Design a protein around this ligand. Structure first.
Ligand SMILES: [Mg+2]
Ligand SMILES: [Mg+2]
Ligand SMILES: [Mg+2]
Ligand SMILES: [Mg+2]
Ligand SMILES: [Mg+2]
Ligand SMILES: [Mg+2]
Ligand SMILES: [Mg+2]
Ligand SMILES: [Mg+2]
Lengths: 171, 171, 171, 171
């Protein structure tokens, strides 16, 4: 074992490695959504940049976990990043709803990892999660929630003008 | 009595204390409206900030009355601030209409206090009301009136896109 | 329920709404103390501003809870803000002692809400309390404690010159 | 009559001339108080400057009335300025109490002149009084009241150290 390792449980380490991968998956899913709205037959470019920013963020989150792992004397073990669930994302409402579920999935995983850290009595990993991840996630969930509400206000599945305006005003 | 008190009628003092409380009530009602539009299922954030600004204003008005009271040798006597009449405010039109009534209620109370001050021949309280409150109130009533007219132009109870646009342009 | 809500217990939500109100009560009590020292027959103006600052702070704390609530998908439900316990606050020592009890009451309520959040396994609300409230409270309790000690050193209930000096040096 | 005169009653004019003189009297009384505290056996120099500032203010008030008079087509008629009531003013508390009475006397005279202007239906003189004099007077009465309270807190008739400190901190 690492000469640095202290109070770092094996399960925690494994869960962090798992979380890292989920982060890269989420990043990759947003990369899909970016490419979808950049398409000429979809063309909502501000929506597209919103998702591109988000893929970069989740990628930076995954790297923070890599750094974390090594700080604690754990070892990074990477797995395959699975392709996102869809190839086309429908429209802005459909994509935002997909995004809300993706963020709640990631949020749940983080809460779970927090509970594991609490059970294994690792104060440091608990703080890492609280400080770098948990508030960031409710911020993002609240923002996407707000977007879905406003997309629906604009009567989105059907109203094209509403979707166009959302691109020019909410992002 | 206060060594400072001069030409300050007992009724006026009591009415000022009453007015102070009405101001805090109005402030509290706007605080409700702020929280309502900040909700994820309501999400009109500029409307929400409009009302948040207004709660801060009515609170600053209440404090001006506290200061006034002591300047004149009167004594502040606080009462309970009653919870606002509604918990949910419907939509932007419904909330603006509620706000217009609330402002006319406050305006009426101020005009009443002015009449009392005129009857008791207190030039100083009359000027205080004229200078710090009366013009501010017709400004606000005219503004909210304008908003209601524009909300209706946007066909508001029913038109969601109209409500969204109001949030991006009128506030 | 809120599309945003995740791991947010009903009890927690209710307790947050309760805490919000306690904050507004504390704010209102300080508003009393401000008006008391601004009186011409009391006239300690720096003490008065100290309490006025504090009412603004507790009001900003209440608004943070409103924001919090909506971030988590909870719903703000406001109650009446009860008038403060006294109308006159005696002297600077008496008011500071009242303030120390008020702050320990608020502190206790916060610690309680933290225990509830820990029992319901809500890491996010726990962090919110730790980060925005708990340290702020021991800072304030320690400061008011220091003031009471110094007020007593100045032999306060009886020594008027001591009270005057406190106003010019400790605030 | 003045080609400029319009809606300016003869009584009002006479009362303004009277008020002017009262202002110069008040100014002269403060000039006494200034000279008293500048004495080597009294030596409270900040108290002395406070009163010197105040004599300059009441003199500027008298000149505003001269200007007013001519603006309205009235004619200034000056009278003798009577010497102040005392030659020595005792101590800082005694002088402040004298000052509080002097200011309430002036305040009363102004309120009276306002009532006369209201009876003669002169809106312009009423506004002049409200704008340039009435608020200034309650500000000053509240300030001197505060001083008397603090002088008494310092146990003034008897406590010399309290008087010294007041000079270094309240003015
Ligand atoms: Mg993430
Ligand atoms: Mg995220
Ligand atoms: Mg108001
Ligand atoms: Mg208003
Ligand atoms: Mg607090
Ligand atoms: Mg506090
Ligand atoms: Mg004057
Ligand atoms: Mg004056």
């Amino acid at each position: 074992v690492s000469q640095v390792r202290q109070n770092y449980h094996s399960d925690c380490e494994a869960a962090v490695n798992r979380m890292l991968n989920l982060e890269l998956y989420a990043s990759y899913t947003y990369s899909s959504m970016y490419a979808f709205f950049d398409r000429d037959d979809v063309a909502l470019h501000n929506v597209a940049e919103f998702f591109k920013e988000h893929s970069h963020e989740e990628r930076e989150h995954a790297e923070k976990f890599m750094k974390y792992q090594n700080k604690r004397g754990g070892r990074v073990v990477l797995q395959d990043i699975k392709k996102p669930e869809r190839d086309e994302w429908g429209n802005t409402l459909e994509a935002m709803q997909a995004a809300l579920q993706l963020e709640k999935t990631v949020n749940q995983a983080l809460l779970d990892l927090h509970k594991l850290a609490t059970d294994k009595v690792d104060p440091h990993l608990c703080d890492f999660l609280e400080s770098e991840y948990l508030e960031e996630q409710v911020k993002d969930i609240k923002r996407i929630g707000d977007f879905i509400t406003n997309l629906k206000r604009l009567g989105l599945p059907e109203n094209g003008m509403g979707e166009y305006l959302f691109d020019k005003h909410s992002v």
